[PDB]
Amino acid sequence: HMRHRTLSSSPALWASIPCPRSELRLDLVLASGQSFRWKEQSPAHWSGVLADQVWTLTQTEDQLYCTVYRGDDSQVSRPTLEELETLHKYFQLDVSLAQLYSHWASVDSHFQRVAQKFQGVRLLRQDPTECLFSFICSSNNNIARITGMVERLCQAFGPRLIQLDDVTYHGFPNLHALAGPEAETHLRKLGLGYRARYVRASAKAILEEQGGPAWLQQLRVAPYEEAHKALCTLPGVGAKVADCICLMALDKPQAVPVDVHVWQIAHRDYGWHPKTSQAPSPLANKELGNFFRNLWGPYAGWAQAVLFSADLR
Ligand code: NI
Predict the structure, then answer these.
(1) Which residue range is the domain that position 260 belongs to?
(2) Is 181 part of a structural domain of the chain?
(3) What's the number of domains the chain is made of?
(4) How many angstroms is it from 116 CA to the middle of ligand 1?
(5) Does some domain include residue 137?
(6) Catalytic residue list
(7) Is residue 121 situated within a structural domain?
(8) 94 CA distance to ligand 1 middle (Å)
(9) Same structural domain for residues 220 and 272?
(10) Which residues are annotated as a binding site?
(11) DSSP single-letter state for residue 297
């Protein structure tokens, strides 16, 4: 029976990445919303899956402490350099948040007030497949419910990696696993509802009509507007979901997902109304997304995430 680690209960198995807490708050970032796969299994210790490894992460004011569970295969040891470089990339630590916050507050009076309390909110750089199917599950859904759908989906379809205490960790499934003749039926038993059909159909579509997961990497290299349009050809992927994926997995920092909640924030906190009829809609939604890119600049999606974190708490 292997156990989740804490920094005190096994110090020899942890490795540090220098990182001030003003650049990264784990409790604000790893909290369900961007990813649905991290859980605080003991206080201040976040455990979750990256690719095919399980990690536990914790931090001081100055350091990000990391430990990785490779399975029953290897002898237990500290994270390697390359494994740490993965986390560095995952948290996009090359991007200075202090500078971004400063720039956003300079033209946005409301962001300034809000951001004081909620520093260290950045965007994870997520796997496109995981991101796509997680956000297909997000339509007309809440975070708690999405988290359950995603976990149950991984448990039924993805490979087992390891078990820690009562938690069995699964990798996110590949396209082929989600595309089969039984997939939708199974996913309905897991409670996805109508979302079940879109998961299977989008997996099939990518495989049969786009040339497999290599297509998702091409979108990572394509410009935001083309990637966004391409994603909107998938079953169940409209503007909000395409924008989520653009921002969180295809390196498009200007992508700004718009739904009824963003509409709320914008109207209440920014006084925004559409300069158009509106008797929400796709053109009005895009206008709101344009309002925020106009206001915040090319990292508008990142600024939005700060506000979404502040509102949720
Ligand atoms: Ni009004």
Answers:
(1) 95-115+256-312
(2) yes
(3) 3
(4) 27
(5) yes
(6) 240
(7) no
(8) 39
(9) no
(10) 140, 145, 195, 257, 259, 261, 278, 304, 308
(11) -
